[PDB]
């Protein structure tokens, strides 16, 4: 019954998460700059679908996750998947002010976003999150902690173990900040700042989900059955 996650040390937790990291994938290699909904969304949904498969295998390597029943694992991933895709996107885009790095060969600015009905709004929100992460000098070790927190938290109320693991990750975040030389006050201030961003990320996911829903009902850009089911889970 006892989960190994809680017995892990801060450094052990950090290494586990870093080691679990999925890779950065590439998009199709057509040198044309996508402006139409068809071409652009085709690339994005294809990319998202491929990222989902990696995400699923990443989640299983997050300490404490596989200790949950399959049904609970399904629930958490169904609720968090888009938030996780988005925070990943934002992370990759941090060193590219004003642009979203969907893939190394697919860097887009809001000019291409505004060519798709109802896209630029979400686009600007993603840019704002990226810029915010950049100004806070978010570290990769912190990034991976935030992502696992999203995985365990987003669907945790729509249900002790998860909350203990969540506490464990909080310990880890503070650990990293102290290790980086931050004072006590800076530590909790920074902890709060990062967590508040998770509220905005939830907001972006909900909006993105509605956008994906209309896409489905317009039935122009074909969606994988996996992507369709992840969407359908949100009613």
């Amino acid at each position: 019954k006892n989960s190994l996650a809680l017995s892990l040390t801060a450094d052990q937790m950090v290494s586990a998460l870093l080691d679990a990291e999925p890779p950065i994938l590439y998009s199709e290699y057509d040198p044309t700059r996508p402006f139409s909904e068809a071409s652009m969304m085709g690339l994005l949904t294809n990319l998202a679908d491929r990222e989902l498969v990696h995400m699923i295998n990443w989640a299983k390597r997050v300490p404490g996750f596989v200790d949950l029943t399959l049904h609970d694992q399904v629930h958490l991933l169904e609720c968090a998947w888009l938030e996780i895709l988005m925070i990943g996107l934002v992370w990759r885009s941090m060193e590219h002010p004003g642009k979203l790095l969907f893939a190394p060969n697919l860097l887009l600015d809001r000019n291409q976003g505004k060519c798709v009905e109802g896209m630029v709004e979400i686009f600007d929100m993603l840019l704002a999150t990226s810029s915010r992460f950049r100004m806070m000098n978010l570290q990769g070790e912190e990034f991976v902690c935030l992502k696992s927190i999203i995985l365990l938290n987003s669907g945790v109320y729509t249900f002790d173990h998860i909350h203990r693991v969540l506490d464990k990750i909080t310990d880890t975040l503070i650990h990293l900040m102290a290790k980086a030389g931050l004072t006590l006050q800076q530590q909790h201030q920074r902890l709060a700042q990062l967590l508040l961003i998770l509220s905005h990320i939830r907001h972006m996911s909900n909006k993105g989900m509605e956008h994906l829903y209309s896409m489905k009902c317009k039935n122009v850009v074909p969606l994988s059955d996996l992507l369709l089911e992840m969407l359908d889970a949100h009613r």
């Binding site: 699923i56 295998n57 399959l70 694992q73 399904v74 991933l77 169904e78 059955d225 996996l226 089911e229």
Partner: peptide, 10 residues
Amino acid sequence: HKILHRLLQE
């Protein structure tokens, strides 16, 4: 039934 359920097992 769900693909996700299958992928979580693989």
